[PDB]
Amino acid sequence: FMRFRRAFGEYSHVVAFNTLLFLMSFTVLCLTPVYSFLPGVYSVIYLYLT
Amino acid sequence: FMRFRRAFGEYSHVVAFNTLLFLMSFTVLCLTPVYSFLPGVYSVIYLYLT
Secondary structure, X not given: OHHHHHOOHHHHHHXXXXXXXXXXXXXXXXXXXXXXXXXXXXXXXXXXXX | OHHHHHOOHHHHHHHHHHHHHHHHHHHHHXXXXXXXXXXXXXXXXXXXXX
């Protein structure tokens, strides 16, 4: 993490959060066609969390 | 963008807008031969925006 903060300057805070959100959404999308509940409730959870 | 901000010192802000306006004017000049409306209205909009 110390090595990571050396690059990307001030924008590392934005980059890390964007990557984390993309990775969180990717797992849900990959797990979508087994539990059909996820596309509905996950959108509400994301809206509340944002 | 971080790499660009590493160089050019304080004048990166001046360089960026100067390049963007030049690109916009180049696009407008390229669209001139078919759309004859552009030279007047675009100049007026540019004067308003400046």
